[PDB]
Amino acid sequence: FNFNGLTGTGVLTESNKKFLPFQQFGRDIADTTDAVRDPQTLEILDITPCSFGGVSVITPGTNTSNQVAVLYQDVNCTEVPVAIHADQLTPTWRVYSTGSNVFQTRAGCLIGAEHVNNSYECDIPIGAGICASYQTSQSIIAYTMSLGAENSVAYSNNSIAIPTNFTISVTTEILPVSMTKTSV
Amino acid sequence: DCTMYICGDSTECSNLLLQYGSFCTQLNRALTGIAVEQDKNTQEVFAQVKQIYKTPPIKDFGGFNFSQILPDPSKPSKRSFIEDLLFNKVTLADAGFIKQYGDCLGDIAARDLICAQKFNGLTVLPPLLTDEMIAQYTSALLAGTITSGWTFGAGAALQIPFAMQMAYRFNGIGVTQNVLYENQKLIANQFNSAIGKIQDSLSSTASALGKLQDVVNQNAQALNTLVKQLSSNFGAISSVLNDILSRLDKVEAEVQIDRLITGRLQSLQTYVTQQLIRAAEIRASANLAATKMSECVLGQSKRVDFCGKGYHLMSFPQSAPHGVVFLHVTYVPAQEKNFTTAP
Amino acid sequence: KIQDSLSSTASALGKLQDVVNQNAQALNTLVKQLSSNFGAISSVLNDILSRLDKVEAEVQIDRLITGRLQSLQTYVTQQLIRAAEIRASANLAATKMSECVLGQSKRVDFCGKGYHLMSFPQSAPHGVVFLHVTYVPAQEKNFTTAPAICHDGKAHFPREGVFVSNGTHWFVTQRNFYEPQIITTDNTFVSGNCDV
Amino acid sequence: SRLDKVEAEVQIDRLITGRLQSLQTYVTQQLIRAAEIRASANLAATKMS
Amino acid sequence: LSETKCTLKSFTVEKGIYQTSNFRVQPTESIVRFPNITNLCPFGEVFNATRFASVYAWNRKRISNCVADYSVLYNSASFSTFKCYGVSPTKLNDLCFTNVYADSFVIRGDEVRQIAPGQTGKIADYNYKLPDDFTGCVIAWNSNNLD
Ligand SMILES: *[C@@H]1O[C@H](CO)[C@@H](O[C@@H]2O[C@H](CO)[C@@H](O)[C@H](O)[C@H]2NC(C)=O)[C@H](O)[C@H]1NC(C)=O
Ligand SMILES: *[C@@H]1O[C@H](CO)[C@@H](O[C@@H]2O[C@H](CO)[C@@H](O)[C@H](O)[C@H]2NC(C)=O)[C@H](O)[C@H]1NC(C)=O
Ligand SMILES: *[C@@H]1O[C@H](CO)[C@@H](O[C@@H]2O[C@H](CO)[C@@H](O)[C@H](O)[C@H]2NC(C)=O)[C@H](O)[C@H]1NC(C)=O
Ligand SMILES: *[C@@H]1O[C@H](CO)[C@@H](O[C@@H]2O[C@H](CO)[C@@H](O)[C@H](O)[C@H]2NC(C)=O)[C@H](O)[C@H]1NC(C)=O
Ligand SMILES: *[C@@H]1O[C@H](CO)[C@@H](O[C@@H]2O[C@H](CO)[C@@H](O)[C@H](O)[C@H]2NC(C)=O)[C@H](O)[C@H]1NC(C)=O
Ligand SMILES: *[C@@H]1O[C@H](CO)[C@@H](O[C@@H]2O[C@H](CO)[C@@H](O)[C@H](O)[C@H]2NC(C)=O)[C@H](O)[C@H]1NC(C)=O
Ligand SMILES: CCCCCCCC/C=C\CCCCCCCC(=O)O
Ligand SMILES: *[C@@H]1O[C@H](CO)[C@@H](O)[C@H](O)[C@H]1NC(C)=O
Ligand SMILES: *[C@@H]1O[C@H](CO)[C@@H](O)[C@H](O)[C@H]1NC(C)=O
Ligand SMILES: *[C@@H]1O[C@H](CO)[C@@H](O)[C@H](O)[C@H]1NC(C)=O
Ligand SMILES: *[C@@H]1O[C@H](CO)[C@@H](O)[C@H](O)[C@H]1NC(C)=O
């Protein structure tokens, strides 16, 4: 855009701000212009950046596969095509913007991963309790991570459990002690 | 997002930053390290036991009342009464971690601080374990320590009546178990009143959870300072890239843009450095919480003043926002009487 | 089994390899950042000194000096933070050696999951490996139990162990291993009457 | 004394950037030393108890 | 996937989740919104005048509500000096100027260098001084056949 000489790039939306008659631009705490008054029609417009929203790509090893799942944090799924301006985008990024493997997590909308009802250990942590993995015809699945085996203790006020055997276990603990000494 | 923070949709700035691209790959590498480290901290503190023990159906602990500290099903979350007082005390910057574009759309963007952060590429990622999962872990630790004593930490959980476990622990501090069996009723009533006093003190004072609130405030302030430093000129004719690119040609423009690039890159470098130092202090605190979880929830500690002032009997973990609260039950000697002695 | 697991899996020593990789990558990033222009006409000092005279040259060279000095400053800062994390890990490995290799630790989970019996140090590249030998109870069995025992209107508590019954007869056993013994005035001590 | 305010601000901004970077380096190294002193004070506290 | 490879800077990616650098959107469009002005600026009255003022009592003229299409000067005017401060000459076609003032006068040719920020001399000292933080343009041309 170019508004009265102020050039830039962004998405233009209608604004609620009211400028005093001697004012033409409005600025943020970061001092960037976020509101403008249209010269031909004196209507306030808001200027919003176009890139927005965090994007993560979930991949198994490229050695294993070239499937990917894309996580759009801070967009619900209904608004994925609007938030990333899916129409400007290439056809591939469009199949990803809509597809059919659209799953709504609390971390954001996850597209390209199949949601399963099972629970496993975490393989690729996605967030908000969701993990992803490459599982079997192979595909990327997204699931709620398992905290562990559900268990119960047979407690009563006069029952005790005494071990009658034992194991001698030997476990390894690795600790770094030093790092490389460098000089410049 | 470096390009978005430093350049904010300007192709000319992006082409200029391609000179300083290694620094942004480095910054994002450091931030990703900090993030996976936060998740590992929560793992190391709460996921010690991988069996999820369920609370016993009938509560018969010998007059000890754990209703306040044990999960209640009526609430949708499996959280204790105390855990809820704790989650109500610490006020976070924003809840949900999903602020939609349609929500930041409009003049709400300028008004809201989180929208201003998101429009400049500063994102807050959600933690891997939700608060419900952390509450399930803490409930598993309570049900294991209540029903099995310390045995569930060493191997398979072996049930034992709670009064017998308290007699064990009384042995652990040098008091013969007959003392507890003869004062079972008093001890239980003293415990219960102590828990009630904990609950009352939490429900009254608002600044009890000072450390967790301080962590939250410091992170929010760091992000807000990072956003404010976009108004700095750094020696350029303006602090807005669009003004410079509107007024000057590309040869007269690149001197100013390179000044803005150096200054904004130094702002991000200072932010990441102070986050690495804060993450090292949080990691030291999470290693301490993992040691108090292993050594004083999953056992009885003989270390003096490690778990409470007095002779440590047992501890109970409660999950707090971004933290953990230990309820250390100790035995404090009282009503001293003078006597004459001999070797 | 330790030896077999080590000889099979290649990614067992993840932490030491991560330290090595981070140091190597820090040095390689430091080398790559010599290709940055930092706002100069070139990233090669010889090009600038070939094309420009010393007055037109010093503006560019001072730009390269500021940028390369900031690259070294960032490297040293991140090395100080990594050395503080390695020093915390080396202080932990010191305590673990004294507490576990040179003694038996009663701290729960400080040295392996279970009750600690012994530990054995092995030297690894840039690190240390502890082989912790612990005692893990197995094959538990249910019993009926009781806090004390009435004999003559007096309470008898076990000296060490628990009163257990196999259904009909009462014994006293140690807590971590089933070894029933006949209840005796040696196994027990008396304290007060029964009602309490 | 030598330069007018337009010719002066290029030099002063160079001095400002350098002296600000000197203070930033000082504060960073103080934060790292204070983290090492704080680890030593936490050890002395445990040793006292 | 390619965006990830680009951010990572390698052709191979390990298993995991990766943040991406937003290479997806390209603007591919342009908007121009200027005020609705029709009058040409008074280039005739300012640059093509019978009489200029003396430098000691120089003339100030307010310029408003006009389009600065200076290519109308290409046919008639030739300027020995045209130096702009705080703005690039190639950008003048694309801006709207808030408070345009035209200071005009006649001086010796040897003193045209003295009309600039931070100069000294008989003109810059006693007749007409420009501020140090001057934003605008200085235009000069020999008028020996007129003056
Ligand atoms: C995606 O959009 C739906 C539609 O609104 C959200 O659903 C609602 O959540 C609110 C509370 O957050 C409830 O009061 C509504 O009843 C819900 N509506 C429906 C249809 O479920 C949904 O929450 C959004 N996604 C996420 C992750 O929040
Ligand atoms: C206690 O457990 C050990 C193993 O931990 C048992 O030893 C094994 O016993 C089985 C059959 O009883 C043999 O087939 C194995 O070869 C034995 N292993 C070893 C290493 O000797 C032991 O018998 C158990 N004791 C009791 C009382 O049940
Ligand atoms: C544990 O303490 C709670 C109080 O914190 C007891 O709960 C009260 O019980 C009475 C009668 O049983 C009710 O009228 C109250 O409404 C309860 N208050 C709450 C907050 O629940 C509870 O009964 C105690 N545990 C046992 C086993 O008695
Ligand atoms: C133990 O004995 C000492 C000395 O006999 C007591 O200390 C004194 O008690 C008097 C009151 O009778 C106080 O005025 C003094 O200040 C106490 N200290 C000294 C050093 O004289 C002490 O109170 C006795 N403790 C108990 C529990 O009986
Ligand atoms: C100890 O006794 C309890 C209860 O008598 C046992 O728990 C039950 O055993 C049955 C099988 O006989 C299972 O189906 C249940 O799930 C167990 N738990 C409960 C709460 O009923 C327990 O197995 C016994 N342990 C040993 C080692 O004998
Ligand atoms: C509990 O243990 C006692 C003692 O070992 C058992 O008592 C005896 O039974 C054995 C046969 O199994 C006889 O040889 C002994 O003479 C008995 N002695 C006494 C004092 O009764 C008892 O049978 C065991 N009960 C159970 C249910 O295992
Ligand atoms: C005889 C030489 C004495 C010089 C002493 C050194 C001081 C230098 C400073 C000023 C002197 C230079 C002359 C100034 C000419 C400017 C006249 C003008 O602008 O229209
Ligand atoms: C990794 O790649 C090699 C060849 O480059 C292949 O033989 C191997 O199966 C791959 N492994 C995985 C886990 O993708
Ligand atoms: C999981 O269970 C829900 C019901 O709780 C059901 O609607 C859904 O189809 C199930 N998903 C799969 C993949 O079976
Ligand atoms: C030109 O601008 C005026 C406002 O000054 C407006 O009223 C008029 O409609 C515009 N004419 C157009 C857009 O054709
Ligand atoms: C400038 O003035 C002269 C003298 O009248 C005239 O001949 C010429 O056409 C004028 N040019 C312009 C562009 O006004």
Coordinates of C-alpha atoms in Angstrom, one line a residue, chain B residues 66-308:
Chain B
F66 CA -6.9 -36.1 53.2
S67 CA -10.0 -34.8 51.6
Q68 CA -8.5 -31.3 51.0
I69 CA -5.4 -32.7 49.3
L70 CA -6.9 -35.6 47.3
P71 CA -8.7 -35.1 44.0
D72 CA -12.4 -34.5 44.0
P73 CA -14.5 -35.9 41.1
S74 CA -17.3 -33.3 41.2
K75 CA -15.0 -30.7 39.6
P76 CA -14.3 -31.5 36.0
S77 CA -10.5 -31.3 36.6
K78 CA -9.1 -33.9 39.0
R79 CA -7.7 -31.2 41.3
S80 CA -7.5 -30.9 45.0
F81 CA -9.1 -28.2 47.0
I82 CA -5.7 -26.8 47.8
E83 CA -4.6 -27.1 44.2
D84 CA -7.5 -24.9 43.3
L85 CA -6.6 -22.3 45.8
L86 CA -3.1 -22.4 44.4
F87 CA -4.3 -22.0 40.8
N88 CA -6.4 -19.1 41.8
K89 CA -3.5 -17.3 43.5
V90 CA -1.1 -17.1 40.6
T91 CA -2.4 -14.8 37.8
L92 CA -0.9 -15.6 34.4
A93 CA -0.3 -13.3 31.4
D94 CA -2.8 -15.0 29.2
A95 CA -4.7 -18.3 29.5
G96 CA -5.5 -20.6 26.6
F97 CA -2.4 -20.2 24.3
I98 CA -4.9 -19.8 21.4
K99 CA -5.6 -16.2 20.5
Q100 CA -7.1 -16.3 17.1
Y101 CA -6.5 -13.9 14.3
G102 CA -10.2 -13.0 14.4
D103 CA -9.7 -12.1 18.0
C104 CA -6.7 -9.8 17.3
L105 CA -8.5 -8.4 14.3
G106 CA -9.3 -4.7 14.6
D107 CA -8.1 -2.0 17.0
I108 CA -8.0 -4.8 19.6
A109 CA -4.5 -5.4 18.2
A110 CA -3.2 -2.1 19.4
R111 CA -5.0 -2.3 22.7
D112 CA -4.0 -5.8 23.7
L113 CA -0.4 -6.5 24.7
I114 CA -0.5 -10.2 23.5
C115 CA -1.8 -9.2 20.1
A116 CA 1.1 -6.7 19.8
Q117 CA 3.6 -9.4 20.7
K118 CA 2.1 -11.9 18.2
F119 CA 2.1 -9.3 15.4
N120 CA 5.9 -8.9 15.9
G121 CA 6.6 -12.6 15.8
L122 CA 6.8 -13.3 19.6
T123 CA 4.9 -16.5 20.3
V124 CA 4.2 -18.3 23.5
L125 CA 4.2 -22.1 23.0
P126 CA 1.9 -24.3 25.2
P127 CA 3.5 -26.8 27.6
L128 CA 3.4 -30.5 26.6
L129 CA 1.7 -31.6 29.9
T130 CA -1.6 -29.9 30.6
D131 CA -2.6 -29.0 34.1
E132 CA -4.9 -32.0 34.2
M133 CA -2.0 -34.4 33.4
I134 CA 0.1 -32.8 36.1
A135 CA -2.8 -33.2 38.5
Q136 CA -3.1 -36.8 37.6
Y137 CA 0.6 -37.3 38.3
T138 CA 0.3 -35.6 41.7
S139 CA -2.7 -37.6 42.5
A140 CA -0.8 -40.8 41.6
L141 CA 2.0 -39.7 44.0
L142 CA -0.5 -39.0 46.8
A143 CA -2.3 -42.3 46.4
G144 CA 1.0 -44.2 46.3
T145 CA 2.5 -42.5 49.3
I146 CA -0.8 -42.8 51.2
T147 CA -1.5 -46.4 50.6
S148 CA 2.0 -47.9 50.1
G149 CA 4.3 -45.6 52.1
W150 CA 7.7 -45.2 50.5
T151 CA 7.7 -48.6 48.9
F152 CA 6.2 -47.5 45.5
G153 CA 9.2 -45.4 44.9
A154 CA 11.6 -48.3 45.3
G155 CA 9.7 -50.9 43.4
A156 CA 6.2 -52.4 43.3
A157 CA 3.8 -50.6 45.7
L158 CA 3.1 -52.7 48.7
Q159 CA 0.1 -51.6 50.7
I160 CA 0.3 -51.0 54.4
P161 CA -2.2 -49.5 56.8
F162 CA -1.6 -45.8 57.2
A163 CA -1.2 -45.8 61.0
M164 CA 1.4 -48.5 60.6
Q165 CA 3.2 -46.4 58.0
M166 CA 3.1 -43.5 60.5
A167 CA 4.6 -45.8 63.1
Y168 CA 7.4 -46.6 60.6
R169 CA 8.0 -42.9 60.1
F170 CA 8.0 -42.3 63.9
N171 CA 10.7 -44.9 64.1
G172 CA 12.5 -43.0 61.4
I173 CA 13.0 -39.9 63.7
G174 CA 13.9 -41.7 66.9
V175 CA 10.5 -42.0 68.6
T176 CA 9.2 -45.5 69.5
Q177 CA 6.1 -46.5 67.6
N178 CA 4.1 -47.0 70.8
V179 CA 4.1 -43.2 71.1
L180 CA 2.1 -42.9 67.9
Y181 CA -0.2 -45.9 68.7
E182 CA -1.0 -44.3 72.0
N183 CA -1.5 -40.8 70.6
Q184 CA -3.2 -41.8 67.3
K185 CA -6.2 -39.7 67.9
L186 CA -4.4 -36.6 69.0
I187 CA -1.8 -36.9 66.2
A188 CA -4.6 -37.2 63.6
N189 CA -6.5 -34.2 65.0
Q190 CA -3.3 -32.1 65.0
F191 CA -2.6 -33.1 61.5
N192 CA -6.1 -32.3 60.4
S193 CA -6.0 -28.9 62.1
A194 CA -2.6 -28.2 60.5
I195 CA -4.1 -28.9 57.1
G196 CA -7.0 -26.7 57.8
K197 CA -4.7 -23.9 58.9
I198 CA -2.8 -24.3 55.6
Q199 CA -6.0 -24.1 53.7
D200 CA -7.1 -21.0 55.6
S201 CA -3.8 -19.2 55.2
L202 CA -3.9 -19.9 51.5
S203 CA -7.5 -18.7 51.1
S204 CA -6.7 -15.5 53.1
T205 CA -3.4 -14.1 51.9
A206 CA -3.1 -13.3 48.2
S207 CA 0.7 -12.9 48.0
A208 CA 1.6 -16.4 49.4
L209 CA 2.8 -17.8 46.0
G210 CA 5.4 -15.1 45.5
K211 CA 8.0 -17.0 43.6
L212 CA 5.7 -18.4 40.8
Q213 CA 4.1 -15.0 40.3
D214 CA 7.6 -13.5 40.1
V215 CA 8.6 -15.9 37.4
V216 CA 5.5 -15.1 35.4
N217 CA 6.0 -11.4 35.8
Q218 CA 9.6 -11.5 34.7
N219 CA 8.8 -13.4 31.6
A220 CA 5.9 -11.1 30.7
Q221 CA 8.1 -8.0 31.3
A222 CA 10.9 -9.4 29.2
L223 CA 8.5 -9.8 26.3
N224 CA 7.0 -6.4 26.8
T225 CA 10.4 -4.8 26.8
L226 CA 11.3 -6.6 23.6
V227 CA 8.2 -5.2 22.0
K228 CA 8.9 -1.6 23.3
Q229 CA 12.4 -1.6 21.9
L230 CA 10.9 -1.6 18.4
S231 CA 10.4 2.2 19.0
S232 CA 14.2 2.8 19.2
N233 CA 15.8 4.8 16.4
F234 CA 19.3 3.2 17.0
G235 CA 20.7 6.2 15.2
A236 CA 18.4 6.0 12.2
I237 CA 16.3 8.8 10.9
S238 CA 13.2 6.9 12.1
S239 CA 12.2 3.8 13.9
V240 CA 9.7 2.8 11.3
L241 CA 11.0 0.8 8.3
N242 CA 8.2 2.1 6.2
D243 CA 9.1 5.7 6.8
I244 CA 12.7 5.1 5.8
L245 CA 11.7 3.1 2.8
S246 CA 9.2 5.9 1.8
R247 CA 11.7 8.7 2.1
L248 CA 15.0 7.4 1.0
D249 CA 16.3 5.5 -2.1
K250 CA 17.8 2.1 -1.7
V251 CA 21.4 3.4 -1.4
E252 CA 20.5 6.1 1.1
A253 CA 18.1 3.7 2.7
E254 CA 20.5 0.8 3.4
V255 CA 22.6 2.9 5.9
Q256 CA 19.5 3.4 8.0
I257 CA 18.1 0.0 7.6
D258 CA 21.4 -1.6 8.6
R259 CA 21.4 0.6 11.7
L260 CA 17.9 -0.7 12.6
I261 CA 18.9 -4.2 11.9
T262 CA 22.0 -4.1 14.1
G263 CA 19.9 -2.5 16.9
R264 CA 17.0 -4.9 16.7
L265 CA 19.3 -7.9 16.4
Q266 CA 21.0 -6.8 19.5
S267 CA 17.7 -6.5 21.3
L268 CA 16.9 -10.1 20.4
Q269 CA 20.4 -11.2 21.5
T270 CA 19.9 -9.5 24.9
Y271 CA 16.5 -11.1 25.3
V272 CA 17.9 -14.6 24.5
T273 CA 20.9 -14.2 26.8
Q274 CA 18.7 -13.2 29.7
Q275 CA 16.4 -16.1 28.9
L276 CA 19.3 -18.5 29.0
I277 CA 20.3 -17.2 32.4
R278 CA 16.8 -17.4 33.7
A279 CA 16.3 -20.9 32.3
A280 CA 19.5 -22.0 34.1
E281 CA 18.1 -20.7 37.4
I282 CA 14.7 -22.4 36.8
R283 CA 16.6 -25.6 35.9
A284 CA 18.4 -25.4 39.2
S285 CA 15.1 -25.0 40.9
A286 CA 13.6 -27.9 39.0
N287 CA 16.5 -30.1 39.9
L288 CA 15.9 -29.2 43.5
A289 CA 12.2 -29.9 43.2
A290 CA 13.0 -33.3 41.7
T291 CA 15.3 -34.0 44.6
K292 CA 12.6 -33.1 47.1
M293 CA 10.1 -35.2 45.2
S294 CA 12.3 -38.2 45.2
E295 CA 13.9 -37.8 48.6
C296 CA 11.0 -36.5 50.6
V297 CA 7.8 -37.5 48.9
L298 CA 9.0 -41.0 47.9
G299 CA 10.8 -41.5 51.2
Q300 CA 11.7 -40.1 54.6
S301 CA 14.6 -37.7 54.6
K302 CA 17.2 -37.5 57.5
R303 CA 18.7 -34.3 56.1
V304 CA 18.2 -31.5 58.6
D305 CA 15.9 -28.6 57.4
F306 CA 15.7 -30.2 53.9
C307 CA 12.0 -30.8 54.3
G308 CA 10.5 -28.5 56.9

